[PDB]
Amino acid sequence: KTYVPKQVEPRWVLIDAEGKTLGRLATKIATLLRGKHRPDWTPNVAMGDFVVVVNADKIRVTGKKLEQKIYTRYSGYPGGLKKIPLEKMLATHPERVLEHAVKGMLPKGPLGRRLFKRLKVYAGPDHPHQAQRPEKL
């Protein structure tokens, strides 16, 4: 009968964002958010590392993107569809662009959100120097 892990401790990680290609980084970030790298992986628990990102304001992204490529929010009201280009996202709160990527990469369930909270993204550098600052690339 297959092994079930018990209450273990979350491994807090720290990733430097600047230079990294947006989507490419998000993918790995997501994987870390779930277990999926720890061989005691369990799909219904929440055991992914606490990823911390810094210098997110400096994420690289190929092609025209920034100019083109737009994020759309929808208010409930008529015409309530807002459209905001990648450019202006970074202009203001930029950690958004990475978050909206990692979030869209997490499973959509009630667990998915638990995990989305373990992801801490900052304009960086610097952040809550709690405990582990295990540089990672």
Binding site: G76, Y77, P78, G80
Partner: protein
Amino acid sequence: MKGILGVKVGMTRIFRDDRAVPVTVILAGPCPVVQRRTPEKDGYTAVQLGFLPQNPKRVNRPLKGHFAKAGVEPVRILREIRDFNPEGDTVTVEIFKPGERVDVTGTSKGRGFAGVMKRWNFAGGPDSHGAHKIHRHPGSIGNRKTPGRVYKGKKMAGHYGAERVTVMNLEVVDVIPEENLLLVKGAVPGPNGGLVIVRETKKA
């Protein structure tokens, strides 16, 4: 950004040279600056004005401390004029030379549950020629199977007035520091005895 609390006292016309003028009196009252906000430990600049004397009855609260910490007569009301920054003491009608124009924020009278006719000035049915049981109704509120729902924010009967309203760019017709009064172009929201806040406008 100038500013000051006060009460709508009422209104009555006067005579600028030979020319009638509608005017509403506001009791600017003396306002003791109770506290200052600042980016230092507030993230923004603003002055918390006090207004109207409050006897130590209901002041039993921890307000006594917020009051003593600035050492000021305990007031009955206190709001923040944002981005205003005068001088550790008091602001009065002296802030407003006649001719300046001021925005004025008050709370509209309360219509309670108002029909679509009064709330939104809908047309409603005809008093005659048929229907009869729809004289003041809104009529249609949608389409058919598509969208198959009513639009969010559809004008419908509900509570009217009794809300934060701000008429703008009113002319300060006159000011009488002797009685702490202030005269403007009359059109200020809320009922007499209603509290209100005057301040500098936007125009240039």
